[PDB]
Amino acid sequence: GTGYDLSNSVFSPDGRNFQVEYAVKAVENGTTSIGIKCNDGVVFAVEKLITSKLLVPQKNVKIQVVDRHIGCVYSGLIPDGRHLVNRGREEAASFKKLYKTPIPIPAFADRLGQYVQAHTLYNSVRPFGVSTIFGGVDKNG
């Protein structure tokens, strides 16, 4: 039939998740942001559209930090992005508290991954309208 794109956890007959795909639409439509992995670290850059001369320059900062060694930048629904970072911050604190060592970028990745993947499992939640570029330096690179 049809309407396989009205609920968030439904598989269409060809095995897709339209709500997730639509979420991507929100992303592609957002400001551009990038990440470049250099020889001993990473660099994050982002486009900040001046919708008017009224926006204070150097103010509405987009890039966010998780802990002290992780950087995040995303495109799409900004509010959704902060919500994701806020979760990464607790996710990281929880890790450091028990293991003492600041969270490895790889481990942090999957922490964010499992969280986001979880918002595509239930029709009582909406997927994240953001794609995030993040990274940092840890015990091995």
Binding site: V61, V65, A93
Partner: peptide
């Protein structure tokens, strides 16, 4: 001590 270090890590968040 850990509370103090966290207080510092936290104050940095979204704080230019």
């Amino acid at each position: 001590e850990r509370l103090l270090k966290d207080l510092v890590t936290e104050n940095a968040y979204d704080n230019p």
